[PDB]
Amino acid sequence: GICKSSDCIKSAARLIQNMDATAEPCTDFFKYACGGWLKRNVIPETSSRYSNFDILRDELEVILKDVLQEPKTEDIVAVQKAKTLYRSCVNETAIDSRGGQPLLKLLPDVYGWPVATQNWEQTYGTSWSAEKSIAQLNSKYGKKVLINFFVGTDDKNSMNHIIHIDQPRLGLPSRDYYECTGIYKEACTAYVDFMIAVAKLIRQEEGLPIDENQISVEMNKVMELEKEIANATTKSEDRNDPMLLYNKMTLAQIQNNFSLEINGKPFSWSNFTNEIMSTVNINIPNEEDVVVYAPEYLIKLKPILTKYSPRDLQNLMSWRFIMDLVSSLSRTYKDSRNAFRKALYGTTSESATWRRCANYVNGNMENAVGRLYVEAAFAGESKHVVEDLIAQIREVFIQTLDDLTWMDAETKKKAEEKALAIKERIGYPDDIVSNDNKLNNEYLELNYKEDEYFENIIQNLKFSQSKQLKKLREKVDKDEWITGAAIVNAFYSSGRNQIVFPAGILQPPFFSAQQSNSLNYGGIGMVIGHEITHGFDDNGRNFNKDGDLVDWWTQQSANNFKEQSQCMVYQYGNFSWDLAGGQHLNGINTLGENIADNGGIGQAYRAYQNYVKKNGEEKLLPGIDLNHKQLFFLNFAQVWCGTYRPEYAVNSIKTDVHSPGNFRIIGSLQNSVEFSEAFQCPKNSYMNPEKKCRVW
Amino acid sequence: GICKSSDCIKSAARLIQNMDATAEPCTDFFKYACGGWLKRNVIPETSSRYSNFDILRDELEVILKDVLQEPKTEDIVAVQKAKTLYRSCVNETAIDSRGGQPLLKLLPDVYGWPVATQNWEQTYGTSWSAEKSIAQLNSKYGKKVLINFFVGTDDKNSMNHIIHIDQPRLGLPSRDYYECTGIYKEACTAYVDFMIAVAKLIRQEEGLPIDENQISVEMNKVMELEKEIANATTKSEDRNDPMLLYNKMTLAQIQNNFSLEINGKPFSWSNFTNEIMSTVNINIPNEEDVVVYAPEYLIKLKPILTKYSPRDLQNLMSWRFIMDLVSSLSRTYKDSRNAFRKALYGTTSESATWRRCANYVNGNMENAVGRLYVEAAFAGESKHVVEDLIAQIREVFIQTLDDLTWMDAETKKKAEEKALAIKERIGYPDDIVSNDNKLNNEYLELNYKEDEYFENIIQNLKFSQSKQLKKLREKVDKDEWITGAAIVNAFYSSGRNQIVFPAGILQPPFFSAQQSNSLNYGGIGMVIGHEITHGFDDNGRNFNKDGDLVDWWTQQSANNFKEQSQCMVYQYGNFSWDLAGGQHLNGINTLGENIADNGGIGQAYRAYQNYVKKNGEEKLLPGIDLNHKQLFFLNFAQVWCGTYRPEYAVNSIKTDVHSPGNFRIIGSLQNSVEFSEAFQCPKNSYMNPEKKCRVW
């Protein structure tokens, strides 16, 4: 009665290697399911996080390398451009010869860097303006500085595009880094030294004298100004409510309530917005509807920018433009980021060149890379199986509504309607394989050179912003895929109300026709339930079935959701992470993902129980003394067998909206009654507390 | 009748995942046993060769990391010094903060580097001499330049040490690289560029002017000088006969035959040899017996060294010294080797720091690191079982002498006599665990500092050469192990007539108590046969049972041996390696290893069939539709599932005395009648040619 086939041996052996039978499952199920993984695997020098989830990304990068490094001649122009971009990225010999010339030759286009110019006031200072300066970095290179301008979807009109105004990102991962005290001591030191090291090497290449006394003082003005901008930004905890962030107004209204003064002159919003939208031939009148997401940031931005000169402003705006480009120059400019990269990620060396180029080509040509990947790794028979698995889990969430006691009847009536209206995207769009002409025309305006890699990334920056800004007057494409097929992940779209499962995640240990059903539901089954619950967490619940930001909750049901979810904010907020110096996780930022974990793990187990009583039990796996009910939670846990670097542990707490894999297993199973039933966990154990959170 | 234990499950899955069931075992058994490995495992960026053999080493380095990183309160002095050395090695922050100062401060000790010296003739030219320059690089750092000097075991008196004089190695892997054409074109370009880069970095750190043209002139003379020296060395194919290399002559006879003139003055051999041995306070008279291995090289060296100045010679001798230390300095000096390292190994990055550190401490403190390894990963119950396996294969070799028709009766008895006198070493020396005083006393003179890694490696260089030079008047210690315990390899000593099997290799897939006997005989059993046959190949046969280079072969048997061995010279010479760009294997320089492979697997298989006759058939493995006779050859082949980088396939084809793993499987099994019977291979198939080579 025990399976003995080839696939059952390879499946069971993988589970036996990762787990540790000597540990108790009810004391620490992470160390029970990953005890063997922790002893065997060591964090590579190029990885800030290493887990079975990250290994799958590396194995996918391998397949991308085989289909790109091989000039298969009989390829369409799109695939040729995809490979030519790949070759230009790997030839370090040609890149190391230019030094920093390709970056220094286009600096006059972004009004130059004042620290690296002999006389900047006479050459650029006369025609300088904060409007055209921010616009050039935005419209041409996609670098959002000072004010973040981008054309996105209308939250209350999912069919239209609209201009968004929000606070920008920072040179450091988060605004918490600009405290520069305690755990952020080395980061700020390596960040200012990153400026100085680049400032020294740039002046040396232009034949200008090295005035080291001015560089140490002028670059601290860039840090002093950016700390004030970080202090003026709004915390990410106060930005999780989409209803509170939506502030639509006209451009003339933006000029009235959010005025700015640059160099003693008032800032012109119409001039700034038109300097961006003129690149795509679109005029922005004063009655243009614009959604402002950070109104408090723009208010605090006025008293700060009036205290700095145009030279001090261009030093910060140009530095943000250069710090993301020194890694594409010669080795003399690549290694200047090592100290800065080590402070934020702990990696001693950058990842493999072919690995970076495989991700970059997959990021800028996701339809062509996905074409080669699905033809060389993805099996076509996986479509109908995942389609049926979604329908099973979709129906599970519908039936689970009546079991939930924290919602009234009217809220569940249309909460089911949103779940019924969820559309699905599985595998890859069919037009990237059957229509070579459409794929060729998609990258028609792209022209890559074999020995001009820096001119190809600049062309990709201009092409990305040009494509995005042109959608302002156009409707939202209903057939557009939000991701490529060569991605080991899953997604949910609040504005589209759809769940997307690319081919990169439809593989072991998530899903396989040759692995047990207890592992499929424990793998991809929890994934499907995760993305479906994402339409009902602290962010997606504010969107209706049509992707519009409309309140369909009653006051009693909406208040109970905040009460049910408050349990998880305190649970994950009390988790002390030993890899981050005992610091705790953010129970507010990780809330949306924790709701999808605890909700998805229960729906996957429910859909699996419905499959067992319908199709019968399964034969046990040889070599492991666990029933298929216990194998369900084992496969779920073994997905996140991993460990973090100390530097990235502090980074993921403030930047990653997910919890670490250690606590994604602990927190989700602590609130799972079906987990404690399968392993017969005693009362008040670490994995079976009497107080359990429950939302979906 | 199928094994169902947890160890059998992961053992069978390893066999299933590595093999390719779609391939034909009789068309290409390498593809049949490794086709799955080739798709599953890809060469890392830090590996010139990646195979199942190298993975066992990569896994062992992890165990070394765990037993060396964290200090413990009960550690003995020897363990404390190893961890002190390891901690000094991993601190990349302290290493980068020193730049090249540890090397610049040391360079005067080797008469400096003329190209990187402000005035080499004024500082070192007065007291410079070739006798002292070669001697200091030999006795203090182990850098053998121009003339190779070392104190080793007498070939004909295995109980005595004696001075050896031989041709040195080169900066490139072999003399063939100095053709600098075709597959060697890139190596020479990066070689000279390597010299120029280091010459620029050292002068820049010294604050000296940089002359691009002058450095290029002096470094091309270095290549020009080393081209002649390489052209003067005897080919490796002409150095496999130990009887033809043994030329014992007095020091006065060396001065007469191999006179050298340098800078117009005659070279004093007595001055040179005594400048080395004075470091251990040993005088070398002119009656001293010396073994000269390369008389043709020393003669061809006469007209070469006269045409070069003291600056030209020192520019080459110091460069050989510097090129091996540049990877121990800051990152700037590490990156100067990138183009050179990629040309010879294909690696785009240096391996992980902790991996190099663990391997370095394991190499300089093998008894301390071996102690920490066997106490943490090696089961002592393995030694008795391996002792029993050696006795079976040893008896099989003696019984095989009756089947050999190419030997007369009196030579068979002498072959049996040497086989009976073979000593064995299994696991680890007992002293490293049971005698803490002896282990601490071994490293008494070593004293490491926490933050001076370069000072520690230089101290290890003096101590390493000092320990061997002081053995000149000492008898060869018979109990002294020839390898550390934490080594994944096996060794045979011709002078000791003993076979060694360290604990690192007594592990899966070689040996395991939880492993099928068919796999143990195909794994460690073949290794034991490989080691015993080493004493009877084209080199081992020239030594008697006590390890002395004496002729015990009749003229007919010696002629018949060379005829039987000539078969394998053609068989392996005709193998064309695709990874090497179509180059063929060196059947002469790989003859000994090919003989040991062919003879060994036949002994292990015959020993396995004798075991099955007495103990009975074993249980089949799950998911594998193969019998145990087939699993014998399968486990033997799966040890060598791997691939080479093209840059290193050219390297290993001239340096590695072993054949590639691809052809060790093909070549050995092509000559195995039992293999073609076990898999039912038709005659004249690729794996079953009707003409088969046979020695042992």
Ligand SMILES: *[C@@H]1O[C@H](CO)[C@@H](O[C@@H]2O[C@H](CO)[C@@H](O)[C@H](O)[C@H]2NC(C)=O)[C@H](O)[C@H]1NC(C)=O
């Ligand atoms: C990678 O880039 C290098 C440098 O641009 C290329 O090497 C050049 O190749 C052209 C081919 O005609 C020669 O004329 C140049 O003299 C070469 N320059 C150097 C410095 O060697 C190289 O060809 C590129 N790699 C590939 C695969 O195209």
Ligand SMILES: *[C@@H]1O[C@H](CO)[C@@H](O[C@@H]2O[C@H](CO)[C@@H](O)[C@H](O)[C@H]2NC(C)=O)[C@H](O)[C@H]1NC(C)=O
């Ligand atoms: C935004 O304002 C700038 C200047 O404030 C405008 O640039 C001027 O353009 C006119 C002709 O279009 C020139 O005669 C001026 O010399 C320019 N001024 C400077 C300082 O260069 C720019 O045209 C405005 N943007 C839009 C879209 O009208």
Ligand SMILES: *[C@@H]1O[C@H](CO)[C@@H](O[C@@H]2O[C@H](CO)[C@@H](O)[C@H](O)[C@H]2NC(C)=O)[C@H](O)[C@H]1NC(C)=O
């Ligand atoms: C390698 O060394 C050999 C000698 O050991 C060189 O052969 C000599 O070449 C010169 C002319 O260059 C002749 O006059 C001699 O008669 C040759 N002698 C022998 C024994 O062949 C050979 O040229 C050297 N090759 C290189 C590349 O340096």
Ligand SMILES: *[C@@H]1O[C@H](CO)[C@@H](O[C@@H]2O[C@H](CO)[C@@H](O)[C@H](O)[C@H]2NC(C)=O)[C@H](O)[C@H]1NC(C)=O
């Ligand atoms: C060292 O030199 C001596 C003398 O030149 C060599 O001995 C001679 O070898 C030849 C054979 O070619 C004989 O004909 C002579 O009678 C020998 N003379 C003496 C005095 O022994 C000796 O072979 C040389 N050794 C090496 C290793 O080349």
Ligand SMILES: O=C(O)CNC(=O)[C@@H](CS)Cc1ccccc1
């Ligand atoms: O963003 C990441 O780092 C990984 N992505 C994730 O953790 C989610 C993205 S919502 C997808 C997923 C859900 C459930 C199980 C597996 C995977």
Ligand SMILES: O=C(O)CNC(=O)[C@@H](CS)Cc1ccccc1
């Ligand atoms: O040194 C090497 O590269 C590999 N060493 C070997 O191949 C031999 C050392 S001669 C040991 C061995 C024999 C047979 C099988 C496994 C291992």
Ligand SMILES: *[C@@H]1O[C@H](CO)[C@@H](O)[C@H](O)[C@H]1NC(C)=O
């Ligand atoms: C941050 O800004 C607030 C007002 O916006 C101000 O009161 C506070 O002092 C600022 N803090 C820092 C560190 O600049």
Ligand SMILES: *[C@@H]1O[C@H](CO)[C@@H](O)[C@H](O)[C@H]1NC(C)=O
């Ligand atoms: C590494 O060296 C630096 C500088 O010498 C020192 O500050 C640091 O403490 C060292 N690290 C360890 C682990 O000893």
Ligand SMILES: *[C@@H]1O[C@H](CO)[C@@H](O)[C@H](O)[C@H]1NC(C)=O
């Ligand atoms: C070699 O000769 C030099 C000069 O004659 C002398 O100073 C030196 O001591 C000699 N070497 C030895 C080892 O005696």
Ligand SMILES: [Zn+2]
């Ligand atoms: Zn998620």
Ligand SMILES: [Zn+2]
């Ligand atoms: Zn060998």
